[PDB]
């Protein structure tokens, strides 16, 4: 009897509290596709090759559609593709937006607009000489663009302001300040959904639309209670437009945090129990600092979440049997992934870096990150097979492209935590397209068994059709 | 013939009047998950370890989103986190809300507002000197906060009042009084759903939405009869926002009390026959004093109901096979559970207490309550197995974490009430991750059988996939 | 055991990065129909036979419903059916539209109207002598006709202008200019959906409908934010009305480009992973110049996409097993297909040419393009058939219409990339309707197998019911 | 092994391009009904018996509800029932409508109204001496009636007009001229759906509804863009109200023509690939002259389409497994069906003629058209038998009503084109209701087989339950 073992996700035990957790594949994305007796395979995440040299670690990215080019804030410089454009202060993640005439950056509590001519302005009140209203423009937390106006949220006071129509360096003359007020507090983040300005506080998300006022002094934005969601976000960068709405990480104000996707007046959880355990392992800080982004390539719709010790990628295309989460990492010892700020330009996906002043372009026919071999794990779930005495562990691996006959460590665990002997089998060989990755004799399963299936290589890893002979 | 036995809910007989009741697992939550041949396991509720030392028993808790903190009323003091910020009179349960500038407590019929600057005020009528309308302000029953206005229900006269926008310590100048008015009486509780003030009476639930009127004397709230629910609440704390609406315990004015969740003008029953019997056991009093809370952790969506003798937890994430209720208790003699007022902050869930002046932090890797060993009960439904002989009673447990090889009392019932001989099997062992909790020989089934499967532990208990060999 | 091998879509491995890709049929369309034990067959694309001689290569086509005739722009001439009716400058693709009194061509930043009375006008500002408003009428990108008004998009400035009701040669006197304005940039293309002017930018698509305002200077078109889509188009000719909405190619601004179909406020993906890889193989240029068109015949609803090296046809009527894509080509060495600008007039589908100054009429009873034989491929997917020892490779073919006993090359790959020896079998002979295309002996199957099934013909090729005996 | 052979629709090969086509039953209607192990039968189309001798070939028909009679334009006369009530000029198809005081015929570009009192008037402009508006009344293409007003389309000018309320001989005093205007051109046909005037052009079908305006000059009709259909019609008589909306033959302006039924803003295709090929066999001419009609009898809903060489009938009440088309013909050599202009009066279905100056009434217990023996065919789809010997081919026929023992020609093809030997089997006998149409010895099937099953008779043919023994 030949038995197939699912490999898109495994099961194990958390030795800290003896709870059943999910072993997520490392550096492997699940592609659901009927190939041969498998209906899906697993492919290594594309490697990164050095492309440009920047000032420092990346702090922001955005695909400007006005200039049709990628703008990145890395280190202390602002770039338009490769050419430096200006200077940026601060040291942390910065908010970015763009408009008809300038690229705006929210940094260090300032809304700094770099115009395409070459002039750098800052958002500030109208001069007292002009008969225009003066607002309490405090610090700046997050900025967006809508209808030819920059809308930015003041730091922790439940207020936001929109710039004027024909002078973007100053707010609107009469009515520029708006508030949520369907909450005690919370303006943590701000975005633009379709034509609504979305204010994500804590335990509240609100939508504001244009009212089309004509008299001076009237409010130009009105809340829509029919679309408000009773949930917040953890930090100012714990949100992103994922598919057609916003996917975010919930604030601790409504319970234990988890990943949600906005529906219509409600949020639908996307994180599994294991993902929620990983998130809960973080404090309020180290989670308010998480960065969420989205990627799209080869029918893959990925949501990437970076936290100070993890990088979790959720696939919306391979979630036919529940959410599909994988863990990205750099090196061989669970070091946090190095890529960040993915943006697709021309015909290539370009990413920044978290520790060096470099930028990579996500090559597809290699798996090495800046010419360094990487580790891919593929766990199999536990199952009870008393006295099975299994044989012929076969995996279908797509070979042919590599630099060396890189091998594979196959090992078995009997308790769900502790793995035993590791066997090294050639899983690939350059310029050969018929390999038959197979281990003939495996042990006798006493009560439980699980398989590890680790690979370390600089080449793409494709695996499918994991099967055994149970007899 | 190997047969699997469900553990999430057992059957039994009620010896008082010979009825078929359900045996609800004690201190165990059912997590649905494909473990191995089981598709779900049962995990002990996390234990409580002392965190702080308060003035007295807990009287309320609320997550202040304006301050991003947790406010607890315990004993006679009000705490922000761990440090006192004021003194609260009275001894019973109090209502808590918070706004931009203050934290309001409805206690002893007074809306006492503690401002963050150090000023304690009481909501009272406007001075007669001011040219503002004066209202007959009675005792305060329940309070809530919406759009910067405290709305509070006066005791038992079907009236509620909203405070002024520019002075929270006084009611609104011109139109501050409203009446549900679609009911002969009843304002038992108040709350805010999304943007509507929900007023729960006895045998009715009304929604009030903002009119937006600007002229003086015009009502700022209009009833939405389309959303009216023809059911009430038993007590002023017999309601809680559960998932996206309010879940409550119905008032005797509409028949036998039971647990409902509000849909869209409709209430869907959540309680089963056993829960209805448990609720009906108490009088109208001891139901008016019930408490309801909500917890959310590891995809677990628990609705907790505290009563004078029963603490019942309904899991909304494991109700696929019908509602899933469990019983939480302290000690080995069905004493009521001690933890109360659960609230998550930072990365920990903290709970008050019902008898001692302490606050615990709900540690997960232990199962004891303040270093006191706990009793966990499971049950299997009665089945007719005439002349069958049971062997190889296997139960799968994830062992490994324990300070003692805690044992397990297995016993069988043949009539559904009385359980026979009790046998001790080592169900756990320190630092051993494969145990195979098993009993070789079970007796011959005469007519019926059920199993007890009691555990006494200080460490987490995980159990799944009970099976027997019926032959 | 007789096993059926589908040929609607094969499977293989890319030899540059070892990824599992699909193998689309070449020059074949899958017609779903219960023929015999098959439920579908595959028929060659109709061949092209020379119809007319024109000035140059095709640059645009349209169906003037006012004149009830096909207008083509080939080389430097504009033809109404056969006879030329004007001259068109430039060298690239031109936009076409028509109305009651003229045929408008958008070319070289100009809106040139050739009127049916024989005279040629051009869209230009109203003379300054009149009191009518003057706009900045720069270059043109895309033009459309709706309600007797020509609406054209200014090149790269987000603005679009409409003509006048009584004078199509000049814009509207008072309010002729409109903008999307819910976007940093993008006016890439313009169209008319049902009664709305649809503007496709980068990462946004907007809809405009008639207001009905009669006062001077009032807006005549209003944007409908409810119908907007958060996606753009890759180029100005990367869109076509397919069924009841616009099928387009997404712009690199929203991520990796692919093929979408607009629904109601959202875009439904169409392209498969292999098609997305093929699209991604192209840069921003050589993708913005791609063309898309729609064909309809014999219930076939084809969406054709022309790129510098690939012509991809998507069949909407045969997409019950997922999207159905095929590749068209000219010659035997995967060149770009020469037929372009299909339009059905009278009872014939007439098409232009990409390399010569000719026009074909798409004969159905042949398959040769301008009396030149073509090559069709029918791959079958790989499968694991260890030691199968297959026999009796049968394909059911409808023969009889042939000018020679055309053969068929049958070959098998054992890895998905490299194919073996080719055996020639008569799949056709003139004036015979019983042929039994069959190969008796096929070799033992080692691990995998796939069949190529290539034909080179001047005659129609119909194939169905590919089967083997595996024993 | 007894196998049932379906007869509702066979399959064969068109030898011009060797393409699989659906062999439609000739003069046979499929009637779904559980008779015996068959679930449906096939009944001969009822024969035509001469009723009246008119002035010539029929040109139009309409059921006048105002007079509760039938108006037929045959030859040069207008007939009310049987009697002649007027004279009509021209020789082609005319348009019919009827109102409160007249029967209106659109012919020769003129709207000629025959009033019930014997007055023949023509729609014409008001005399200039009046104070009412004068329009540019061109020719008349199609006419209809709604709300007491005659609405007619001006030929080839995308405009239509409505007559006056109190004087149907002149257009409305102030606002009688309306224009589609959401289309380059095309007013091919006009009708009324329920209360909406439906204007069918090329590529557009629009709806106009009452405005309710009372002032002079205001538009009585406003376009409803929410119901527009983006498909035209081939000719002025290529549309009929089928069930609740209009079934129509699409214009070549939108691609290859087909048959559609209007839904809600979209047209649902009804034709199959074979019917699309049959339609495409004709040019734009010879298809503009196609005439559509509807029939209803015995739970049979029939859509009849007349072309110069094909009469195709679609049965909407027998389309559970797909469209059910049949071919009607006169004589033995596929001459076009003579019957035309079906209309139900009293309890007789009455039809005109295409060649003779007579009118028939569709007798139900015969099958001859004017005492001429008719031909019926029932093909069987091709199935691969591959060395199966066939015996005992039986068919269930309900005999009894005949004047002679009519015989049936049974033959079998092996390639779908050329048929074999013809065997004559008595399929009917006068006053015998138990016949057992059966043929013992059929040949050996080499590869494929199909059956022709032709019956030539003057009597009704009812066939069902065709079965054969394959051994």
d(CA C164, nearest CA chain D) in Å: 14
Q: Nearest CA to B249 among B274, B214, B284, B295?
A: B284
**Phi, psi at residue A384, to the nearest 5°?**
-90, 115
**Within 10 A of A34 (CB to CB), how many other CB atoms are there?**
13
How many Å apart are CA B94 and CA B88, to the nearest integer?
10
Give Cβ neighbours of residue A69 (< 8 Å, ≥ 6 apart). Answer: A63, A80, A81, A345
The three state secondary structure string of chain B is: CEEECCCCCEEEEECCCCEEEEECCECEEEECCCCCCCCCEEEECCEECEEEECCCCEEEEEEECCCCEEEEEECCEEEECCEEEEECCCCCCCEEEECCCEEEEEECCEEEEEECCCCEEECCCCCCCCCCCCCCCCCEEEEEEECCEEEEEECCCCEEEEECCCCCCCECCCCCEEECCCCCCCCCEEEECCCCEEEECCCCEEEEEECCCCCCCCCCEEECHHHCECCCCCCCCCEEECCCCEEEECCHHHCCCCEEEECCCCEEECCCHHHHHHHHHCCCCCCCCCEEEEEEECCEEEEEEECCCCEEEEECCCCCCCCEEEEEEECCCCEECCCCCCEEECCEEEECCCCCCEEECCECCCCCECCCCEEEECCCCCEECCCCEEEEEEEEECCECCCCCCEEEEEEECCCCCEEEEEEEECCCECCCCCCEEEEEEEECCCEEEECCEEEECCCCEEEEEEEECC
d(CA C126, nearest CA chain A) in Å: 27
Nearest CA in chain B to A271: B299
Interface test mutation site (partner C, options A64, A98, A299, A435, max chain C beta carbons within 10 A): A299
d(CA A97, nearest CA chain C) in Å: 9
Nearest CA in chain D to C194: D230
Give Cβ neighbours of residue B265 (< 8 Å, ≥ 6 apart). Answer: B226, B227, B228, B229
Q: Annotate D402-456 with DSSP letters as a single string.
A: -SS--EEEE-EESSSSSB---EEEE---BT-----EEEEEEEEESSEEEE--EEE
- How many alpha carbons lie under 13 Å from residue C330 in its C-beta half-sphere? 16
Q: What part of C 232-261 touches A (C-beta under 8 Å)?
A: 232, 252-256, 258
Query: End-to-end distance of chain B based on CA atoms, in angstroms?
Result: 5
Where does residue A378 rank: exposed (0-12), middle (13-18), buried (19+ CB within 10 A)? buried
**Chains A & B: contacts with CB separation below 8 Å:** 123
Cβ–Cβ below 8 Å for C365 and D416:
no
d(CA D440, nearest CA chain C) in Å: 25
The three state secondary structure string of D199-252 is: EECCCCEEEEEECCCCCCCCCCEEECHHHCECCCCCCCCCEEECCCCEEEECCH
- How many alpha carbons lie under 13 Å from residue B210 in its C-beta half-sphere? 17
Torsion over CA of D89, D95, D97 and D103, rounded to 10 degrees?
Answer: 0
Q: Does D280 touch chain C (CB under 8 A)?
A: yes
List of chain C residues whose C-beta atoms are within 8 Å of the C-beta of residue D381: 34, 36
Q: Nearest CA to A462 among A432, A427, A438?
A: A427
Where does residue C396 rank: exposed (0-12), middle (13-18), buried (19+ CB within 10 A)? buried
Q: Find chains touching chain B: ≥3 CB pairs under 8 Å.
A: A
List of chain B residues whose C-beta atoms are within 8 Å of the C-beta of residue A277: 298
Cα–chain-centroid distance for residue A263?
Answer: 19
Q: What part of A 73-92 touches C (C-beta under 8 Å)?
A: none
Q: How far is CA A144 from CA A62, A148, B359, D195, in A?
A: 12, 10, 43, 50
Q: Does B101 touch chain A (CB under 8 A)?
A: no
**Within 10 A of C335 (CB to CB), how many other CB atoms are there?**
13
Cβ–Cβ below 8 Å for A401 and C17:
yes
**Within 10 A of D214 (CB to CB), how many other CB atoms are there?**
7
CB B320 within 8 A of CB B331: no
CB C306 within 8 A of CB A372: no
- How many alpha carbons lie under 13 Å from residue A79 in its C-beta half-sphere? 23
Q: Does C295 touch chain D (CB under 8 A)?
A: yes
Q: Does D155 touch chain C (CB under 8 A)?
A: no
DSSP run (H or E) holding A50: strand A50-53
Cβ–Cβ below 8 Å for C65 and D253:
yes
Q: Find chains touching chain D: ≥3 CB pairs under 8 Å.
A: C
Cβ–Cβ below 8 Å for A183 and B64:
no
Q: How far is CA B168 from CA B95, B98, B147, B151, in A?
A: 17, 11, 12, 10
List of chain A residues whose C-beta atoms are within 8 Å of the C-beta of residue C284: 346-347
Cα–chain-centroid distance for residue B372?
Answer: 22
How many Å apart are CA C421 and CA C443, to the nearest integer?
12
**Within 10 A of A160 (CB to CB), how many other CB atoms are there?**
24
Alpha helices, H only, D33-87: none
**Within 10 A of A434 (CB to CB), how many other CB atoms are there?**
14
d(CA C392, nearest CA chain A) in Å: 22
Cβ–Cβ below 8 Å for D18 and C146:
no
CB B176 within 8 A of CB B170: no
Q: How was this structure determined?
A: cryo-EM
How many Å apart are CA C450 and CA C9, to the nearest integer?
12
Cβ–Cβ below 8 Å for B65 and A183:
yes
**Å resolution of this model?**
3.2
How many Å apart are CA C305 and CA D51, to the nearest integer?
60
Give Cβ neighbours of residue A254 (< 8 Å, ≥ 6 apart). Answer: A203, A230, A231, A232, B296
């Amino acid at each position: 009897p030949i038995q197939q073992l699912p490999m898109m996700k495994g099961m194990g035990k958390d030795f800290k509290n003896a709870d059943y957790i999910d072993y997520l594949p490392v550096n492997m994305l699940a592609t659901p596709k009927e190939i041969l007796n498998s209906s899906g395979y697993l492919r290594s995440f594309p490697g990164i090759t050095k492309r440009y040299d920047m000032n420092g670690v990346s702090r922001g990215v955005e695909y400007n559609t006005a200039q049709n080019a990628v703008y990145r804030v890395c280190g202390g410089k602002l770039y338009k593709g490769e050419s430096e454009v200006g200077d940026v202060a601060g040291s942390g993640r910065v908010s970015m937006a763009h408009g008809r005439t300038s690229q705006a950056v929210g940094v260090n509590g300032q809304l700094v607009e770099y115009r395409y001519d070459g002039t750098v302005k800052t958002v500030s009140n109208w001069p007292a000489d002009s008969g225009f209203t003066q607002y309490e423009l405090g610090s700046v937390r997050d900025i967006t663009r809508l209808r030819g106006r920059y809308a930015w949220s003041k730091d922790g006071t439940d207020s936001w302001f929109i710039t004027d129509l024909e002078d973007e360096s100053h707010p609107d003359r009469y009515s520029a300040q708006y508030r949520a007020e369907s909450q005690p507090d919370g303006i943590i983040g701000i975005g633009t959904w379709r034509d609504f300005i979305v204010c994500f506080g804590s335990s509240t998300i609100e939508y504001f639309s244009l009212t089309g006022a004509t008299t001076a002094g009237a409010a130009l934005y009105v809340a829509q209670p029919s679309l408000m969601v009773q949930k917040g976000i953890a930090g100012t960068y714990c949100k992103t437009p994922f598919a057609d709405s916003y996917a975010f990480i919930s604030h601790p104000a409504t319970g234990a945090p988890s990943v949600y996707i906005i529906g219509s007046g409600q949020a639908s959880p996307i994180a599994t129990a294991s993902i929620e355990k990983i998130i809960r392992s973080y404090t309020a800080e180290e989670m308010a600092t998480g960065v969420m982004e989205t990627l799209r390539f080869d029918s893959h719709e990925l949501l990437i979440i970076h936290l100070p010790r993890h990088v979790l990628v959720y696939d919306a295309s391979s979630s036919q049997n529940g959410p599909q989460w994988c863990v990205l990492k750099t090196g061989l010892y669970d070091d946090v992934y190095r890529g960040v700020d993915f943006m697709y330009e021309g015909n290539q996906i370009t990413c920044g870096d978290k520790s060096e002043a470099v930028v990579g372009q996500l090559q597809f026919d290699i798996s090495s990150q800046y010419d360094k071999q990487q580790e891919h794990l593929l766990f199999t779930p536990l199952f009870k097979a008393d006295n099975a005495r299994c044989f012929d562990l076969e995996v279908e691996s797509s070979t042919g492209v590599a630099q060396y006959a890189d091998r594979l460590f196959l090992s078995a665990t009997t308790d769900g935590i502790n793995y035993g002997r590791e066997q090294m089998i050639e899983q690939n060989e350059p310029f050969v397209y018929d390999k038959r990755v197979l281990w003939k004799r495996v042990g006798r399963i006493r009560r439980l068994i699980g398989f590890k299936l680790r690979v370390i290589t600089k080449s793409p890893v494709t695996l499918s059709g994991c099967q055994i002979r149970l007899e």
